[PDB]
Symmetry: D2
Subunit: 459 residues, 4 copies
């Protein structure tokens, strides 16, 4: 069954039980493109913002209290997730988010009406607002919340897991590799201190975006001038948003025209996630190479078994968490290109790529948050080192000749390494065989310098 | 709900939701990869069902799989292919990069369906007989992508090409000013411009078709590493024959090289690259159309787009080019998806590229978005455009560059002085040519008028 | 003619007058790929770093003063650009920069030898060093210098030019446009204040990368452990570098393994340039659209003529500086993808994409620096506004009905706007014709609300 | 030198360096675009010279340009095409996006050369007769790109394909352990892996060839906006005939649609996309090769790469895989260049895409990098690889996954227990099968040894 609703273009048949109205239904028919709509966090921010705007409009005497309280109560239901099935509009809608803004206005109107209070979706629920400031405001609320409350705490869990291994393995000597070739000794702990620093720097990179990611366009209305909103509307709404979210990073935009003509802060936020994707690729690739084998690979560490590896090769177990991490990183890199493409292509007073940009930046936050915690807890925490094998690798590298450079010179040290490899002799015995024990190098000094744990220079 | 049953695999016991048709390995993957909250698409589960039925058919034909087991597997696989069990595939896209988990998801659900019908089949020994995830999962990916290209995207692009070509003919004499660098140029017709858009989409179809010889290559039969170990001789060729008969897609074929087909996913990178060009073309077409529709009074106002919904929650009565916005946002998504596909494609190792589920998600999404938005763009926007022909002819006549056909008579430098003086003095080109004393042995008044006619200047063919 | 030099792989024929030696010549033959090598700024940083390392090795008593002074003098010649033609190696060399490191070591050895001092390219000129810490150090020196001393000052020039127009045009009313459609009034000044903020925020974005862009790997030697360098070598060398460059943004890396296993700071710096490319695309596109015409476009502003526009259409002039800007932005976006691709693909103790990453990040700094200044000085500064045309456009938008929403309601205001367009009437006359003057809207209030300059709500 | 002479264009007089062969408009562009400090490449100036000569030839054939003038332009254009005047093209890549400046650069230098030979020709009226920048500059870009693809890149890829295919044959029986997910898998041969690499390069050639029908499309004849205004009937067809005769490239053709050919550069996006796939393939090949050469003692040590230079300024005697490093860095550059090309390609407006010089720079660079590094990779790395065959056969025999052929005899789950017990007790698969009491009616000792032979397991025949 259907019922008739109307907008300024005419009457529209709407499913009888739906809480949306005419403009949402038009958008259902105009944009059946991906079949996916707003995320939970986006509908939360829309509900939060519509409640805050009604509160301020009531505070200022522009909106009657009976109407404002009914809107506040309905918006709270939306923010809480009680009506997510009432937001059927595709991501790939009009690029201002007008349709999803009106979706929220219409659903609020229907909830309020069922409670005996008539509010107009435009005149009341959208009072003092445009899609052009509210929709990017909800996007930046959701992204700031994702960065502060979800991603950074997940990166902290991962940094801690890596740093714990850096400490546990501080004296687990192994052969360094550069260009994939035998190098001088390092410890596993040293390598994991590098990974931990990459994640720590990732947190610094996300934090550096927050002063502009947290900028909200609310109050600029149609074009940035604030037309049809009272003086200070944006400042007053942001104050309510900070109180409701506990996110002091939210703020009014430095320039109200920049905040609507562009979404540069979303490009910036995505760029930090892109670096984290780059860092995680290196960490996860190293960890699965360390776990490669057990007999045809490096066999440096053992990853926790998480599931049977193979439908055909029995007993084989694969590095599935590194695979999830590196695939997530690839997705973040692609999403980042989509965000930047949208960001560059604003025109005059409005960038109309907001729903697409919002989808991609919020997804990148979600993927990185979730996979970083899983990587920490289901992979890093349970790694074990094959320390005996690692020392054997360290002692087998021909590059352990390197600390002899100051005693015999680079060219002779190179001759030592090549002869040792050719004759399948040790560095120590080749140094002796080449007659190098003498005024420039004693046996005692040779053995001191070839000690691989000392050569790793553990701090 | 807290109701569970205990299933097991070679790794141990797992609690599984009591009503779920999946079993231990799927449940492990549910707990290992809660990353995006989104799993396989309908088309991926369709291809998994189709492939598992085809493998059972061939194993049975060869006498390797008992007919009673084969019947139960074929019937269960058909239910999956038909979409009766999509809620039984809970595994994230961001799973192990071979698709082992979704392969085992299919094997386990088939075993549960067959068991409910009174036939015991083993998910590994029977449902996965002669198979690996490493050949079956990219096979289902290339089936789904080939089907998307041939049966969905190309028909949608044909609809859009036809709508653009129809306007190219309808508007073949609707003269307007060309614009180059956004500046007044010489006359064109709207129809000429739309013939260009139509060619871009026609070329886009050519680009998709050019990918099909390699997009349609399937790894099936190569099993674990490409050698076909534990598969019967010619198993993959026989399975592809079933797949071709079942899908009606002659583009499906065994891979030229069985190692290339598992060590790499270069065919998906190739297919994505064609979609990327289409995104590039659509961006130009959609941008031109919304600029031509800009206004009503402060823009170019060359054409009118069909109204599709109220434009604005605050500015009353305003209507916006929402379909060009959907197109250009889809194009941005395809560009990003394409970068993700190429990133995964480059990073295979030895016998297997383990980025398949991510690559699959992105290529299939790009196919879906372009298919759906191209049809909407054609039918809800292009088909109903109207032209503001009087305004367009005035624009054509107003460009100072209509002096251009006089180059051979008065020379480039004098023609430039004509154009600059006409604009400064707010005079027509014709009157400025007269005022500068250029009418004479080199240029008659009748010749001037012939050369300045803007419709003739568009050289409509 | 040729002479023989040797390395640990054997003897190599080297052009007789070349200052490089065996390992540089091998690299000439191994990597003829792009035909382009290190940039001036990269050879400057190599010379600076080799001089600083010799200074510290001498300070610590590890390198004899006669050798150290000869290396310092030779390295200064290289830093000053006296020997750029002695660096023939392709960008697309071994990904540690080993070849360019040895190029610098060999050229220094030859210069010192011609001055009568023998120094060994490995034992002396490379003392306490690896390619794996020195080459990324020189890259981060060059990139930090580019950010601080070249790009930020150029962006400040552009921000100032945009802000000056924001003030000059503070009250030049026009029609806003959203979705390319007629919107409510703005001023040209307000739009240019938005552009100025984008560039100001771009400077903030570059500044934010400096704490990690300025991290130097020097001292970590082969793998990050500092093997074969004295205690505190990196700290001592960075101190010399800071004193020599005046760039206290340069600093020792927080973690010596991160600083060699990855080049994440270059990815970060490129990402800031990518945002600036995104911002400049919007600014330049708006400016060329506002200049479009003269008679078939928006014709809001006049760009300074810079050159004849057209070889065929006579007297036509085109927005060439916006075109240069938007093409530079495209290049930065592509370079940025190359940098990130290299950044992700390190292995164990070393990322071996450094020469390629260095090329792309330094190019993006150069292009953005140079085009930002040209954009400011050859385009923005000389823009003129077509103020009467702009005022007419402001008055022509049907959306000037918007301030009546609180008096007549959204739905009636929409009917007013649609009827005004259909009948080719003003909003004011349509309001009157629809009988809306009354207890909800007086004629005086209608005229107060339809004032388009007041509707733009110019501040300050 | 500070001496100047006066030249002029339609904007006024310009001081030009006294000895420069360029004139007023080139000098303006020198001052307008000091951005990268790099200008056109050799191949771009060659194509400009070729095209200007062809246009003068056709204008002479049609009686539109006097033979003495046409001959002098043809001679000057040939001097430019052959490289005698490359220092007379000082304009930046990042110029006006139609290439107007480089077009006028060519027109002005030709006029000066002709004048020094005693023949007066006007840069616009004569040297640019029947032409626009908007058709000639993309025409020269597509000539250069088509030539790069056909005459340089494809032959270089054939050298690499041949090198890989030769190793596939040489190593067809060199058994080793497969690796999937980086973990021990079932046997393959090095030859099989290299047959996969060879197919990747063969497919890369197919991908480049597939772009040629549209890469070879030339805009010449469309002049300002695609209408052909101010060019004689059939001018483009006649010029293309000259270009095909002179270059020997039958792929050069008139564009299917003259508006698409100037409003967009979609064929450059398409050509770049094929190079992007080649970069993806080469990354996989080069990564595998440097991993196989990793060591000598702490890595996989499967093969030995030719020594090309000392590896390390500090670690003595170390040698590094420098050619795989060059390949993978070139691939990164191609990926980035490809993103730049697509960005420019999407952003045309109305009758002209004004990103041509930037797009030209990036596509032509990608062709050059891939051509040169593919040949070096083949000749300085692939051809000289040697295999460590004894070590490889030991790796093949060491993989616990060689239990796989026993699946049909003992079942997947019991085979898992065999592989697991073998690893725990450091015993062979064969011994573990005996120790678990599996020899009997289902599996004999002779059948076990047949199934465990690793070279037979690689299924080379």
């Amino acid at each position: 069954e259907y019922r008739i609703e109307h907008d300024t273009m005419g009457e529209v048949r709407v499913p009888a039980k739906a809480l949306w109205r005419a403009q949402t239904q038009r958008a259902v028919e105009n944009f059946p493109i991906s079949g996916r709509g707003l995320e939970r966090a986006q509908m939360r921010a829309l509900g939060l913002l519509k409640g805050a705007c009604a509160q301020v409009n009531m505070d200022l005497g522009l909106l009657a209290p009976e109407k404002a309280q009914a809107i506040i109560a309905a918006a709270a239901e939306i923010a809480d997730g009680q009506h997510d099935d009432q937001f059927p509009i595709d991501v790939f809608q009009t690029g201002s988010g007008t349709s999803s803004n009106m979706n929220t206005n219409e659903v609020i109107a229907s909830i309020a009406g069922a409670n005996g209070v008539a509010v107009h979706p435009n005149d009341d629920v959208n009072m003092s607002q445009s899609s052009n400031d509210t929709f990017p405001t909800t996007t930046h609320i959701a992204a700031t919340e994702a960065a502060v409350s979800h991603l950074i705490p997940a990166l902290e869990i991962l940094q801690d897991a890596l740093a714990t291994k850096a400490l546990e393995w501080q004296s687990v000597v192994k052969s360094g590799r550069t260009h994939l070739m035998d190098a001088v000794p390092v410890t596993l702990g040293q390598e994991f201190s590098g990974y931990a620093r990459q994640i720590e720097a990732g947190i610094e990179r996300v934090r550096a975006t927050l002063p502009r990611l947290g900028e909200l366009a609310i109050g600029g209305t149609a074009v940035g001038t604030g037309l049809n909103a009272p003086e200070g509307f944006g400042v007053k709404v942001v104050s309510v948003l900070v109180s409701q979210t506990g996110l002091p990073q939210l703020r009014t935009a430095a320039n109200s025209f920049e905040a609507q003509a562009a979404r540069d802060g979303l490009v910036e936020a995505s760029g930090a996630l892109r670096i984290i994707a780059v860092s995680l690729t290196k960490i996860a690739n190293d960890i699965r190479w360390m776990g490669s084998g057990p007999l045809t690979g490096l066999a440096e560490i053992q990853l926790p078994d998480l599931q049977p590896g193979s439908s055909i090769m029995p007993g084989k177990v694969n590095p599935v968490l590194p695979e999830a991490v590196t695939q997530v990183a690839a997705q973040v890199i692609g999403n980042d290109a989509a965000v930047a493409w949208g960001g560059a292509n604003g025109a005059f007073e409005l960038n109309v790529y907001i729903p697409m940009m919002a989808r991609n930046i919020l997804e990148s936050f979600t993927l990185l948050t979730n996979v970083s915690k899983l990587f920490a807890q289901r992979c890093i925490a349970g790694l074990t080192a094959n320390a005996e094998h690692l020392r054997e690798l360290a002692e087998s590298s021909p590059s352990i000749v390197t600390p002899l450079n100051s005693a015999i010179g680079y060219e002779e040290a190179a001759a030592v390494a090549k002869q040792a490899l050719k004759e399948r002799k040790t560095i120590r015995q080749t140094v002796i065989d080449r007659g190098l024990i003498g005024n420039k190098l004693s046996l005692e000094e040779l053995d001191r310098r070839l000690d691989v744990l000392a050569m790793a220079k553990v701090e």
